[PDB]
Design a protein around this ligand. Sequence first.
Ligand SMILES: OC[C@H]1O[C@@](CO)(O[C@H]2O[C@H](CO)[C@@H](O)[C@H](O)[C@H]2O)[C@@H](O)[C@@H]1O
Ligand SMILES: OC[C@H]1O[C@@](CO)(O[C@H]2O[C@H](CO)[C@@H](O)[C@H](O)[C@H]2O)[C@@H](O)[C@@H]1O
Ligand SMILES: [Ca+2]
Ligand SMILES: [Ca+2]
Ligand SMILES: [Mn+2]
Ligand SMILES: [Mn+2]
Lengths: 48, 48, 181, 181
Amino acid sequence: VTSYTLSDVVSLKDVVPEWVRIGFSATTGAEYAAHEVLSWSFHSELSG
Amino acid sequence: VTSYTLSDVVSLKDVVPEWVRIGFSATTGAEYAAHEVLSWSFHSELSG
Amino acid sequence: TETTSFLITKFSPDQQNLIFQGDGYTTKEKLTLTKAVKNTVGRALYSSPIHIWDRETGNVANFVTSFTFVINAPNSYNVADGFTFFIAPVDTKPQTGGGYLGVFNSAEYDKTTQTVAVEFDTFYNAAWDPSNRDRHIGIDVNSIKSVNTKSWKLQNGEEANVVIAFNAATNVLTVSLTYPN
Amino acid sequence: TETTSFLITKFSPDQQNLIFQGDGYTTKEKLTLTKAVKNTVGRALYSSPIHIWDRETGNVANFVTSFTFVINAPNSYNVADGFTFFIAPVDTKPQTGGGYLGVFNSAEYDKTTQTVAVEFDTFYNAAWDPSNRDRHIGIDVNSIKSVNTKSWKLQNGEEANVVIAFNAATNVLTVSLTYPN
Ligand SMILES: OC[C@H]1O[C@@](CO)(O[C@H]2O[C@H](CO)[C@@H](O)[C@H](O)[C@H]2O)[C@@H](O)[C@@H]1O
Ligand SMILES: OC[C@H]1O[C@@](CO)(O[C@H]2O[C@H](CO)[C@@H](O)[C@H](O)[C@H]2O)[C@@H](O)[C@@H]1O
Ligand SMILES: [Ca+2]
Ligand SMILES: [Ca+2]
Ligand SMILES: [Mn+2]
Ligand SMILES: [Mn+2]
């Protein structure tokens, strides 16, 4: 098993709008490769 | 505390499309009333 | 395997995860479907399509939904027309109003409607509603004439706690409405 | 309280709860963003808008996402450009391609992009990528020049298990990637 971790402080409320859409992106240029997703789950909780 | 319960067999697979949208509706006619929703939660699981 | 879920304990003025139709909108932490006015319709749908069944496997989803609703009638004797929780094609628009509850267009089975609805019917439509003339909860399948009903005593202005669940193993749809009093 | 959740372990040929852009589509139970072809882009977004924060209360959401991805490269040593998980305005369309990953338009900070992304960058772009030239995981905030990176050894054709979480109490975005070997 090979693992990696990365983290930082991101002031979300100052960068993205109140409502957003989430997703995946992938691109190729002069060099390329196939990019695929096998499974995906998401959960968000905003309090009042 | 007053509860009302109802149940029936409904072959969803033979009535609605594979994909659906769920929601609420309310109408009035010659007689009327205000219809409001205060809270809503939903959970579905399709296991193949 | 697929699951979809969401929770809204109180509505915000800009509820972007809902699609509004007719008179539907959010205000004062609540979702207004109709105000107390005649001949109108209001609907609100969850923005994301839901996967209810799969043709290849033949699998059908299990699901449960809970919500609290209130009906405020300016009168105690003249109330109409009702409210429903419905499951319909992804690009559904409001259907016939009045006694048709914005979800059906006839009391005859119409396979093209492709809609199942749980109704909380407050007005007796002689052509198809239960002859006892009571307000009632009903399960509707491609028709405003319910496949099953249960007499219900409307409590004007009271919060009704509803739970609707579907069991894919038995194809049973169950509905429960509870008032605190 | 407002929550949004979903899970998809196998993708249908018509995964209606997703919005596809560019070359994105589903095939063989997988979500493909690009095939091994030059100068292309593919994106896939969840259908429902998600409530991340609220101005009046100042409340910010806690969230977590899990996904497994695979990069298949003909020549294991000539690979580009990468893949990301992103959070953007509701009406987002593919941005600059190539090294910009379809989500950003400059290495310069652009407040108007209003996008945060976690990138899995397989190609060294001298104008802004880490000087060691390593492929890397990065946290991007309104720029293709990551606020933080970690060197990552791409395992061609292997399933990368990713978890990304955001803690609103600390504004901390955490990322983890694991390979079976
Ligand atoms: O072979 C890559 C080589 O092409 C250039 C342009 O000549 O960059 C293109 O290809 C990269 C790899 O796909 C992309 O990151 C870049 O956006 C695209 O213009 C050179 O910069 C690079 O050395
Ligand atoms: O006042 C009720 C009376 O109005 C009629 C039409 O004249 O029905 C309308 O109002 C009902 C109650 O809101 C609706 O259910 C119905 O769809 C609408 O046409 C009469 O049929 C009814 O007796
Ligand atoms: Ca009726
Ligand atoms: Ca790069
Ligand atoms: Mn009825
Ligand atoms: Mn990079």
